[PDB]
């Protein structure tokens, strides 16, 4: 059942839908800004209506 | 996943903000408000504060 | 009417914070910074 | 009560009010005043405060 | 004369609170919102 799903193919003919690869290293959410704003009651809830 | 070749990582990195603050005043606000939850005048609450 | 204790305005300060997810490259506004090399048909010293 | 057909219910529902307050300052007022009644620096007094 | 410690005026804020017992209906000002239907004697598409 795995040969029938084209597991036999040359892996060099499989292209990403963008044609590119990617190495992402992004500074992310830590949560110190949101917890700080909650204690000061400035912006307690950050989730918007949308 | 034989042709993926793409990696994604996330950095939970932080800075230091502001000058002329008072850390003892905020630390009082932090550990006083969360007093029905985490015990105030604790080592962990003081660190996170 | 609900009178509530607030933080006095003189004991706090709004500070603007600029949040970025990554450091921009040297030729950030350049779509193709490699066209200075690909178009050096005489050479570079 | 064979023809009543009418019901009455009451919702003890609450909201969140105000912005820019200080909850630790009121919580200090609450648990300091009711100190001859309920022990201050208690889990219940901190929660209700 | 009785001098008493009060709360300084700058460390509290009066906030107006609007208390309602129920959410008003869509046609709140209409006594009979069902008269637009009861008077459609030709039909509605």
Distance from CA of B40 to the nearest CA of C (A): 21
**Residue B7, H or E segment:** strand B6-11
Q: How far is residue B21's CA from residue B49's CA, in Å, rounded to a whole number?
A: 14
B28-32, long-range: CB within 8 Å, 24+ apart, which pairs?
A: B28/D24, B29/A39, B29/A40, B29/D22, B29/D24, B30/A39, B32/D24, B32/D27, B32/D28
Whether the CB-CB separation of E13 and C9 falls below 8 Å is answered with no
- Locate the chain D residue with the closest alpha carbon to A37: D20
Q: Strands B6-11 and A22-27, how do they pair?
A: parallel
Place of tokens 């660190």: B47
Which of B28, E12, D31 is closest to A40 using CA atoms? B28
Q: How far is residue E23's CA from residue A3's CA, in Å, rounded to a whole number?
A: 62
How many beta carbons lie within 10 A of that of residue A36, not counting itself?
14
Q: How far is residue E2's CA from residue B20's CA, in Å, rounded to a whole number?
A: 40
Helix (H, G, I), strand (E, B) or coil at C30: coil
Q: How far is residue D10's CA from residue E25's CA, in Å, rounded to a whole number?
A: 19
> What is the stated resolution of the deposited model, in angstroms?
3.2
In B1-49, which ranges are continuous DSSP H helix?
23-33, 43-48
How many beta carbons lie within 10 A of that of residue C38, not counting itself?
8
Half-sphere exposure of D7 (CA within 13 A, CB side): 2
**Residue D46, H or E segment:** helix D43-48
Report CA-CA distances (Å) from A23 to A20, B20, C28, E10: 10, 39, 18, 53
D18 reaches E (C-beta below 8 A): yes
DSSP E1-45: --------GGGEEEE-----SSPPPTTTT-S-GGGTTTT--S---
- Contact check, Cβ <8 Å, A40/C22: no
Phi/psi at A12 (nearest 5 deg)?
-90, -5
Contacts of residue B35 in chain D, CB cutoff 8 Å? Answer: 27, 41, 43, 46
Whether the CB-CB separation of A14 and B3 falls below 8 Å is answered with yes
Q: How far is residue B37's CA from residue D43's CA, in Å, rounded to a whole number?
A: 8
For A1-49, strand residue ranges (E) read 22-27
A3 reaches C (C-beta below 8 A): no
Whether B and D touch, i.e. at least 3 CB pairs below 8 A, reads as yes
Q: How far is residue C42's CA from residue C39's CA, in Å, rounded to a whole number?
A: 9
Whether B and A touch, i.e. at least 3 CB pairs below 8 A, reads as yes
Tell me whether residue B35 is exposed, middle or buried, using C-beta atoms within 10 angstroms of its C-beta: 0 to 12, 13 to 18, 19 or more.
buried
Phi-psi region of D22 (alpha: psi -120 to 50; beta: other; left: phi over 0): beta
- Locate the chain C residue with the closest alpha carbon to B10: C21
- The tokens for D3 are 């023809």
Report CA-CA distances (Å) from D12 to A38, D9, D15, E21: 26, 10, 11, 11
Q: How far is residue A24's CA from residue B10's CA, in Å, rounded to a whole number?
A: 8
Helix (H, G, I), strand (E, B) or coil at A27: strand
Q: How far is residue B29's CA from residue A39's CA, in Å, rounded to a whole number?
A: 7
Which of B37, B41, B46, B43 is closest to D43 using CA atoms? B37
């Amino acid at each position: 059942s795995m040969l029938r799903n084209w597991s036999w193919v040359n892996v060099h003919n499989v292209h990403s839908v963008t044609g590119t690869s990617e190495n992402v290293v992004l500074a992310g959410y830590v949560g110190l800004s949101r917890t700080h704003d909650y204690i000061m009651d400035t912006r307690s809830t950050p989730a918007t209506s949308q | 996943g034989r042709a993926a070749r793409s990696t994604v990582r996330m950095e939970s990195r932080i800075q230091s903000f502001g000058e002329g603050k008072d850390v003892d005043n905020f630390m009082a606000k932090f550990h006083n408000q969360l007093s029905g939850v985490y015990e105030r005048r604790s080592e962990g609450v003081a660190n996170f504060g | 009417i609900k009178t509530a204790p607030v933080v006095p305005p003189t004991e706090q300060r709004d500070m603007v914070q600029e949040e970025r997810v990554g450091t921009p490259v040297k030729n950030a506004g350049n779509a193709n910074p490699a066209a200075d090399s690909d178009n050096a048909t005489e050479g570079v010293v």
